[PDB]
Amino acid sequence: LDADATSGAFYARYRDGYVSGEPWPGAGPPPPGRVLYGGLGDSRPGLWGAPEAEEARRRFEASGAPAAVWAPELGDAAQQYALITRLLYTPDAEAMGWLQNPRVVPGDVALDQACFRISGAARNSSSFITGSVARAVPHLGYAMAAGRFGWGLAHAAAAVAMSRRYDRAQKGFLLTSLRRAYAPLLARENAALT
Amino acid sequence: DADATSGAFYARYRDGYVSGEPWPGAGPPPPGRVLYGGLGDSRPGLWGAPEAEEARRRFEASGAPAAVWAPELGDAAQQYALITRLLYTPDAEAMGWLQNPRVVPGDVALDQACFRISSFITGSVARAVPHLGYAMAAGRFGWGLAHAAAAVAMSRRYDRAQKGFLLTSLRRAYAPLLARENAALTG
DNA sequence: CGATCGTCC
DNA sequence: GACGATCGG
Ligand SMILES: [Cl-]
């Protein structure tokens, strides 16, 4: 009955009231001395100078590659978003396998434990809302605060990669689909916000 | 890394696949069977079963997408079209509907009957979304939006406001893709 | 009761 | 592969 949609005409007319580069409603930077963590608007204090944050930041700066376990104390969220987004398009990178099960050193686990420790949350579990399904992907709030819809690819790809319901070949098809969808969006968004 | 920062790298990216062409290793299920599990696997059909007929006339009476879909209810292309359109309808609560849909006793009866005729791999993270193999066999990259959105909706790491931002992000990315692919594969 | 997901085989 | 902790319908 809905020939307007199956023919593509409906999607050809798509538009919204949101502007790229402007903050998503209710989103914004974390308070001073704190970093984004958990749900929308939630935050935890910073761990700059702690032994866990200092060890991980040095490994991150000495490698030039995206960190396996990322935290805002390691550097710019825009830099880790750019690295992961690029990794999703680089040939023979096996990015979906890296997002689900990255090679983790003991320093990455300590950084992850210290990040939840300072948060003051009661219980850590599979149900705890963290704002990122994969620890390598920065908190989604930084994309919401910056109005960077192209940074949603990293989260959408990581959600598919973390799911236990698709096999390797099925995940590869979804990465190809996501690649096609986001490539013109990323090109337009990066050109405008620079 | 100015090529990627300026966006020129992403404007140049091109794959080697063609919309409408079968994905490598993917195809229709064997005659008399329906796609199931991982890539290439399948299970026998239930087209004449009562549970499949009780949920078919329910899905055929209401022009809305089924809450628990199965190939015995109709063509996968129809359910994919309804879910994709629903993901773009303002105030549809599509992400919450994918995660926790209203389920009748007839839906779980059809659910149970599919496991009996047949690992954690199912080929669809949400039961309303048809098996991914149907999109891979049809070369429908636009049918990945339903799976990508459903994966986000099923995740426990984002709250509702965070999922809403990703829905708009997925909307803006897939809208030009869907307009081009739907027009090319339907005329 | 189902799910995700940390954590092993 | 699985087992379990742990939340929402
Ligand atoms: Cl194409």
Numbering used by the authors:
A (entry chain A): 293 to 486
B (entry chain B): 294 to 411, 419 to 487
Wording from the paper:
The IE gene product, infected cell protein 4 (ICP4) is a transcriptional regulator with a prominent role within this cascade. ICP4 can induce the expression of E and L genes, while conversely it can act as a repressor notably of itself and also other IE genes. ICP4 homo-dimerization is mediated by the DBD, this region interacts preferentially with a bi-partite and asymmetric DNA consensus sequence RTCGTCnnYnYSG (where R is a purine, Y is a pyrimidine, S is a C or G and n is any base). Here we present the crystal structure of the functionally essential ICP4 DNA binding domain in complex with a segment from its own promoter, revealing a novel homo-dimeric fold.
The combination of the ICP4 DBD, residues 258–487 (ICP4N) with a 19mer DNA duplex matching the consensus site from the ICP4 promoter (IE3_19mer), resulted in the formation of a stoichiometric complex, which can be readily separated by gel filtration. It was also possible to form a smaller ICP4:DNA complex using a combination of truncated ICP4 DBD, residues 288–487 (ICP4NΔIDR), which eliminated a predicted IDR, mixed with a shorter 12mer duplex (IE3_12mer). Superposition of the truncated ICP4NΔIDR polypeptides with ICP4N (chains C and D) indicated no global conformational changes and a backbone RMSD of 0.8 Å for aa301–484. However there were some local structural differences. In particular the S-loop in chain B of ICP4NΔIDR is in a different conformation and lacks clear electron density for residues 412–418, and also the associated 12mer DNA is notably shifted compared to the 19mer DNA, with an RMSD of 1.6 Å. The ICP4NΔIDR·IE3_12mer data therefore indicated that the isolated globular domain can bind to a segment of the ICP4 consensus DNA sequence, but with some local structural readjustments, in comparison to the ICP4N·IE3_19mer structure which contains the complete DBD and whole consensus sequence. Characterization of ICP4 in solution by analytical ultracentrifugation (AUC) and SEC-MALS exclusively detected an ICP4N homodimer in the presence and absence of DNA, and the truncated construct aa288–485 (ICP4NΔIDR) was also a homodimer. In comparison, the affinity of the shorter ICP4ΔIDR construct (aa288–487) for both WT and mutant DNA was three orders of magnitude weaker relative to that measured for ICP4N·WT. These results suggest that an absolute requirement for tight specific binding is the presence of the intrinsically disordered N-terminal region, whereas if this region is deleted, the affinity for DNA consensus sequence is not only reduced, but approximately half of this consensus sequence is no longer recognized.
